[PDB]
């Protein structure tokens, strides 16, 4: 680790030079050089580059895959002014809340939104319960109402959690698929499949191909999919997700966050650059020019971009949507939802039996996984006397 | 990506891939079957993946070091070599390729360690290990050393370790060889930290009289002058040194509709007095499997020495851990001196069988991990592959799974988290 | 033999089997033979024959203690078909069925002169019997040996005809368990009635009918109740599936006389007076031999014990009672307490069963190599030929060959 | 609280601890009842984890360290002025992690016991043992017989020329530094087994074989502690104990255990002990009344040890304890006991050489405990599935208690929830 200057590590999602273009505004006005770098495999270098104290002082990544950094406790806290915590939506600071204090800075926001063909469906439904009758009307014209990815729990969980449902009780303690409100949401979904308003084999590609070829009226996707539906000429709107039993569908919210290192000796100067330069109207648009940040959580700027109705509804779904879990890497809980949807959609179990078995099949999958990690930890500790070769030694030929 | 009527062959860029191209189109001239010879971005792994989904080479060109993984997964078709064409290939050059009573493919080249000496520093090499310390006695007046080879890899050390004489790496004769190896180190005829880079760099500049290497090194040695000879490895106690012998073979896919014409290329065209030399012109094969034309090369005394060394050597181990790590740290500990030679052998043997225990409880825990994934049908894998998973016996479930996963949602991230 | 069946009653061969043959031999009953012979042949020694309950001989067959047995087609028709499947284990017969045991509906002829033949009569007829201060039916529900007959009454047989995880989530176990729990919500029966609470209810005489086999018969004799026993009620046109325990004679695999054990068991023990002599000391109950069983069937309860066993369920051959008992254990208590739905309780207990049995053999595997390492280091100084025996035993039974070597059993290193 | 309860092993002077304990009719007006349950050291941790048990417990110091990691005890509060009245090395014996744990009572170590009618002056070196046994074998006897099966008896000679169990670093016995493979460990070990291969000793002798042969006059010497003394006074031998012989000029180092006591962590009366201890038990007549019943051997206090030292047997016990060094407190000591012993057996059998049997034993030991922890974890996760499934009907207060306990002792907590499922892994 070095002192005298500040740095930044970002990928090719958002403009690598837009941040540079805002980068030298800092050093032009201050004199502290800010190098801006884009390491290949950023999410795979940081806990490596930081655990010994080296690396950046600040850094950028998402909030959904952020459960590998906070667990090793590295990102230092920030005492932002109350006047600063009032520049972004009050619910944004919870997405980067940990142990009680801060862990990074919100910049923008990402969430699933209801996408509908405006010519096929001029007024999209606001209610899940009215789509089966709507679909029957549309299948007589050769179309389907709603087609989105049923394979990944990321898309299907909002409806399963629509009735009094949410990921955690606030921290594991157990898998969160037990509540009887998920029975109601999962029942409705497996019905849309068994009554043939939906197919259980619909993946992301099939749902995307059906919408831009104009074969379906609605689909579930995020701002990342907006690029490919504009190549097609389908006239589409973007609105809030449909409600169920009166409660709104709440998707997962991914938020890019500007964390800063605890081994970082330029703590404050990193605050001055992010708070007073990056995180206001002038800084983001330098970033937003090279590549769009999507909806940004900064009230000042979001509203002027909220003139785009797609970006405004993307955020509206995010404010209601609940925060992407701090226990992730996509396992445990993720495994219980997916196996519950698959077995119930094919009719092997009623939904009551499916998610009850799928959840204890999840917790007992991770007692096997962590058991296997230990014997291999003991394996690895033995040959220390002398990363994928462990696959051909254990997936070898002989028994 | 499969096809009927073409032959596609894949080989490392180690080997002349142009040579096979040279032999390839001559095939399509006398026949009409257009052949394509590529050396894809690292074929050692890409093959098992694309084998399982059915595509890939019709003929795969490789050694019999790692064909364990290929035959038993069952996607390298069985062979039918006529008896009239048998009787030529060395009695032993198949034993290496013969797996599970049935033949996997046909061997081409044979590669083995050979004692490499220059003729400038000493005219005629010593034929046994025990006299090396005495000859080394007066090669330092000039300032030079007699022998430097790689001591880190068991591939080089094991020929001397087991030169004298489950069972285990700890035996009465393994002491003898190991004891002689480390006593050379304590007298500064050799150093425990000498690796492949140091040993080859010293001989190629000519301050070492003898080395132990294979024909893969001869390219760099030819390029760096040094008038050198190649002979049989030094004897220990009276028993010959037995190096690990790789035979480089030609596997053919089991998903290939053209398996008849795949042989037609290897049998009557590839392995001949002519087409063999065609690939070897651009790539030194060392010794070769055919006999009608192995002895042309045997005029070259360098290639003859490796053949005599290969006929005495063992077949490489085909399982890439345990015993290999036992011999490694047994040599490492005793060479640095911090543990007695017999203390190192005892400590190596218990770490080895404890390595295999810790290894195969992981394989049992692993087999349990995927038995749970197939049952929950998290994958939606075809009902055929799920019952076919449950039909296969316990040890091969791991392979039936991943071939029932390369098919297509992916469960490759579930498995790569397990490690 | 053991001390619960006839030692001398079967030792009376010297007076018959042996005289014709000139082959002197005779039994003796070591006490607590439960887990005591698993190793006298683990040598090649041991007796030629052993009798004991069919509970679990499969653990003593794949480990190589029981050879294949020779019943002729004419001799197999001398015993009931269902008892051959008791000792039939992976396609081979490893023993000779002698006597069998099963549940039966215990009626009494004063409250209800004609007992119910189906299960749906008892909710509707329990009414009559409810009011007057009693109850029509009640039995142990806290251990699945009693609850499984009705739960599995509609559906597949599971064990009669590979053994690992047939599964309890079948739609029939729903109908069985749903009907049973519907009996509790209508208060035809209460959720907390195990063995003694159920027997004391019938031995203090405030319930009409019960479920239990022959081992309890004497307790109803002493308490003044006039009862018989009959066949269990059918559930949805299909008979109930009570667990059929069998007493069978297996003959060792290292035995010297493979065919002399068969010639004696088949033509001398398994004949009318052969099994009789031991039935004189013993109420052998229902016997597998159709010839004599018909004469014991004068007792209408042995005929009912038999009839319930013919269509009954064969006892778990392997160590399945580790997962299955537990699978059908936790499924009932979680469902009867209203904590889970019948469907949620079945699939959970199903998957809870096979994933804890996986942990257990895994714990067996790491312990086996833990104990195996202890004998390679000679830390215990095992008299050597107590240690070749350990190294040459089957990788599974190796952990009990190690107990042979020297009661007291420490190992408390794990606890 | 209100009363004082004592646990002490049944082999000690437990009732001699009542005469001293019944003398509490002074200002304390509090009574004590001494109690001697067997398996006591096993039972205290499991019941004191729930907050019950005696106030003070007399036990060897080696297991007090395994207790205090779980916080089964409480902070000690000795004054530094009275700390000196004991022997300063005994304070390091019970000092654990940087703390105190107990108050020293007795010092216990091995010593050379000889037959004077057979052997008038003992040898002071191990090197002259083989020549002395050569003379006694001519007369039908042997020089030395002691238990070779347990490394506690063989450790003094294996450690003379610079052998140690775990190296004391700062306040801590270095666990990556094992001293059973040091130059003098080998020097002591071969000489131990050359005694066995030259037929001077025999690898089959255990404690029972040695004790009977020594008290029947069949051997001239034996190695034992103060516990075996009374059996030798019943014997017909005129015996005495003395220094242990030196090896290569250095004296042997026997393991020094101290019998001492603690004050329960959740105990309701912690200050009430401290007097019984600090002021009473530990006074000249305090230990005299328990040495009255069953002798304590060497005591940490001076003014009564000095009275005891006039009998040369306890003076030899204390002196052999001075050159000996304290037994570590740490769970890895069992891996030490396993490593040293399997090395002795295979070296005494000629099965392996001494350098070879030592190395094969050491990594056998830690590879064995690797399987132990792996066996404890699959067990721990296995019983978690048993209580979470409610198969054995508990919940009430016994279920969340178990689940809130830290994972490491989710076992002991579970089988003290037995208000049955035993060795099901042997089926």
Author numbering:
A (entry chain B): 3 to 172, 178 to 393, 431 to 443
B (entry chain C): 2 to 166, 181 to 333, 336 to 425, 429 to 439
C (entry chain D): 12 to 172, 178 to 422, 431 to 439
D (entry chain A): 5 to 423, 433 to 440
Please give me the paper's original passages concerning this structure:
Murine caspase-11 and its human orthologs caspase-4/5 are essential for the non-canonical inflammasome pathway. Caspase-11, -4, and -5 belong to a family of aspartate-specific cysteine proteases. Their activation requires oligomerization and autoproteolysis. The CARD mediates caspase oligomerization through CARD–CARD interaction.
